[PDB]
Write an enzyme that holds these catalytic residues in place. Structure first.
Site, mmCIF file in Angstrom:
data_model
loop_
_atom_site.group_PDB
_atom_site.id
_atom_site.type_symbol
_atom_site.label_atom_id
_atom_site.label_comp_id
_atom_site.label_asym_id
_atom_site.label_seq_id
_atom_site.Cartn_x
_atom_site.Cartn_y
_atom_site.Cartn_z
ATOM 1 N N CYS A 97 56.485 90.181 73.139
ATOM 2 C CA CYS A 97 56.572 88.956 72.389
ATOM 3 C C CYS A 97 54.988 88.517 72.367
ATOM 4 O O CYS A 97 54.578 87.996 71.236
ATOM 5 C CB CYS A 97 57.345 87.991 72.806
ATOM 6 S SG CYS A 97 59.194 88.487 72.413
ATOM 7 N N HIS A 147 56.019 80.413 71.293
ATOM 8 C CA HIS A 147 56.664 81.356 70.598
ATOM 9 C C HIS A 147 58.033 81.049 70.208
ATOM 10 O O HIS A 147 58.514 80.098 71.182
ATOM 11 C CB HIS A 147 56.878 82.328 71.924
ATOM 12 C CG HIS A 147 57.783 83.526 71.567
ATOM 13 N ND1 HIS A 147 58.329 84.260 72.463
ATOM 14 C CD2 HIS A 147 57.972 84.092 70.209
ATOM 15 C CE1 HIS A 147 59.105 85.319 71.839
ATOM 16 N NE2 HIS A 147 58.945 85.328 70.548
ATOM 17 N N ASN A 180 63.805 84.851 66.192
ATOM 18 C CA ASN A 180 62.904 85.086 67.115
ATOM 19 C C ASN A 180 62.086 86.158 66.548
ATOM 20 O O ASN A 180 62.501 87.337 66.253
ATOM 21 C CB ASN A 180 63.266 85.579 68.398
ATOM 22 C CG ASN A 180 62.021 85.899 69.505
ATOM 23 O OD1 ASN A 180 61.338 86.463 69.180
ATOM 24 N ND2 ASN A 180 62.485 85.335 70.411
#
Lengths: 321, 321
Positions: A109, A245, A275
């Site tokens: 990520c 994030h 996400n």
């Protein structure tokens, strides 16, 4: 160096929690309170990571005409590249007919912030005048649609920024980057190996130990953030907007509180896109720029956590273009 | 920056051209005349890219005890990672208890030179004191053993170097990096998509247009090499050793003559290890150093070409630690 241009893209097809209640043992509430996600975008049938990357750069070009001029490098931060080779960065370089070196960066990520740091180094060391840093993920291609745990968490996306020299006073002020592979069993999806160095076997689908990943994000996001702000020569009060994030609202929530922050100084969109991994932060920055929450001169903090384990954070004084 | 330490490794199992005759429509003669390859190493069934990388780092530590001291980052150049996530570099980071950030770099065969350049940038830009740059590939895991035209071209292996500050007069003097993604259909291996941007349908395994990759190779090799030498402010005559990617002895021999070089000035190990991709150059370098072909202060030229299409070249003044 600093960010000279930005653009992002999400696939057209939307998928509501309802869409998930239509075939999986889960409710909209389970989702809305456990993750904070209401909807997410899904790439068309024949739309892959490279396409999301192409579309994100086109958006960058619509908003910033002639921005790829002087770009000598394309770095695509992704974990779902079209092929092992050629790399997706080479495909992006071709598409926009650039004279540039190119490569994909795999670091979970946090890959995009990792790419920004790498882009910064390249510009500062003079190996590249400008660098096109792309964060693009097509998770809907490796996600087990049936697995309750995953299915509702990930959304597809693409983001991009051009990193280059900016005026005195603007640009990147700090970077905090890190990894810890002993926590490789906590989040993964094999490729060429069937097991990890500790022995944890891997299956043909995305796996996640949410409970530990939660514990990690929270503590890491917080330390990194302060470390970065501190390394940047500022204090939380100097930060106009925190952009984390977009993995889980509870996590973002939990991390904001731990920093004495009002939701107004925190960027959110995990509710609308899920996400999107590496595309997460650029997707958020784009909305903030357009809403005017981010403006030339502001101090913005970026922070991310993910598979690896990996984590990263950066402080950038916006603009200076 | 310069190279502080170096290490490499190749698996124990040997595969001779005869081992291929024992089950394939081919002859030793066709193999040796077409590529120069007589042998190649194959990783054990329980040995993957990460393992090859560990072994390469272990060799490096044996040659330079205490070289990971000061290593702030790990970059693993590979096209056969154990997983899409965690990244291989993180597994390396944990295995050696390094306090550092980590990521895998995907840029085809030139990946390792690409990693040296990014590493050099992290050092010069101050984001890392030292960087562990690995080139490891377990091609045997993705190869189609029943394909007479590819199955005999590759070998497994790993290599590694530590990049950091070196005394004045040593280190990297130049880097030349490039990509042409329109050459995507020329060499590939799908990962998430069944087709390339230009529409080239990808088979389940590795495909390779040999005629094109050859023409391109001899071409870019010289141009990139001459450019790197010039960029470093030197002339071919100043180079002690030319260390090209080890894919085909013919391409190597072809390029060699193009520059008017005697074999004594070219490092070659393709005949015993086959094409080991990113591990190719560190391996050849290690042997050159041990055979006394390269010493402190010598100007070495590194050049690679591969999937992307990608190509890289660098000039390094050996030593300086």
């Amino acid at each position: 160096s600093g960010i000279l241009a930005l653009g992002a893209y999400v696939p057209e097809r939307v998928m509501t929690n309802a869409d998930f209640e239509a075939y999986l043992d889960t409710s909209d509430e389970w989702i809305v309170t456990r993750t904070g996600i209401k909807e997410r975008r899904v790439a068309a049938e024949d739309e892959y990571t490279s396409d999301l990357a192409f579309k994100a750069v086109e958006d960058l070009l619509r908003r910033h005409p002639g921005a790829l001029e002087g770009v000598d490098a394309v770095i695509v931060a992704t974990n779902t590249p079209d092929a092992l080779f050629p790399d997706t960065a080479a495909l992006v370089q071709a598409r926009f007919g650039l004279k540039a070196f190119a490569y994909d960066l795999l670091a979970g990520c946090p890959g995009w912030i990792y790419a920004l740091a790498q882009a910064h180094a390249l510009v500062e060391a003079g190996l590249a005048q400008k660098v096109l840093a792309v964060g693009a993920e097509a998770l809907s291609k490796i996600i087990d649609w049936n697995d309750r745990a995953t299915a509702v968490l990930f959304g597809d996306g693409g983001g991009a920024a051009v990193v280059g020299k900016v005026r005195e006073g603007y640009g990147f002020r700090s970077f905090v980057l890190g990894a810890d592979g002993t926590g490789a069993k906590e989040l993964y999806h094999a490729c060429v190996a069937p097991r990890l160095p500790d022995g944890t076997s891997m299956k043909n689908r995305l796996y996640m130990n949410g409970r530990e990943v939660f514990k990690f994000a929270v503590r890491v996001m917080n330390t990194a953030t302060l470390e970065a702000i501190e390394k940047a020569g500022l204090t939380p009060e100097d930060i106009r907007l925190f952009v984390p994030h977009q993995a889980n609202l509870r996590i973002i929530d939990a991390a904001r509180e731990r920093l004495g922050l009002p939701w107004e100084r925190v960027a959110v969109n995990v509710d609308r896109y899920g996400n999107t991994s590496t595309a997460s932060i650029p997707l958020a920055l784009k909305e903030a720029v357009d809403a005017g929450r981010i403006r030339e001169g502001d101090h913005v903090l970026l922070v991310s956590f993910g598979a690896g384990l990996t984590w990263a954070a950066a402080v950038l004084t916006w603009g200076g273009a």
